[PDB]
Amino acid sequence: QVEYRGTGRRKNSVARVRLVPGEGNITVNNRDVREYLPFESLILDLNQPFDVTETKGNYDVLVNVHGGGFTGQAQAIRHGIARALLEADPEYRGSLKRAGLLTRDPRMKERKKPGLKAARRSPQFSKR
């Protein structure tokens, strides 16, 4: 056979997307997406890259992953997939970039500075 592959990066959560022809199926960390990532019923959005690219599908999956929480970690999945789909076919880049998901979000957390405490609240002023 053959298998495609890519890397994933957001929110302190890294994924090495390994994307292979197949049924369309996930075992992240040799473990399924669904029970692993709480809760979670959001994985349509994870398959929307298939809803727009080579739609319907399907290609099976593998990925090693660590760091951060489910939000970025489920969201670190896609850009390795969609990038592996550029590597599959750059034709759908016009179908991707018009819809995103190969643009890795450059945003992340901030730093602290004087003003912050336990809850991220800057201070009051002198009333009375």
Partner: protein, 143 residues
Amino acid sequence: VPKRDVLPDPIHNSKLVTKLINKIMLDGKRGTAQRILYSAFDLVEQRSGRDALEVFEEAINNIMPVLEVKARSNYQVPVEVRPERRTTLGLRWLVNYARLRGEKTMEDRLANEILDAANNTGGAVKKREDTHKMAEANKAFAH
């Protein structure tokens, strides 16, 4: 200036559930909000059992206004709503009245509210009324 869209609902392929779980999403806890709302889609779709959208869409066309007001000396003007603000405020009094039943369950107060509101009753159909009694009472001196 844009309003940071939510993509679809991943439950029944609507959208405004997503806009609505986030309004139940207090403390940034999504799963408990999603939990209790979809549970309410079990309860209301059970009692007088039916589709989600009958009670939902009807009720949120029984309370979801068309005219609001704003002040400006102080003269309160009746105004046409932008439909995002319309739907926005409908859901606002939806949850912000949902607690205000004063009951126990996660969902009965909700499903009571949308069931009642599909029937043009309760404080959300009410705030639509009173709001539209500030509209066309105050047409005169500020429109």
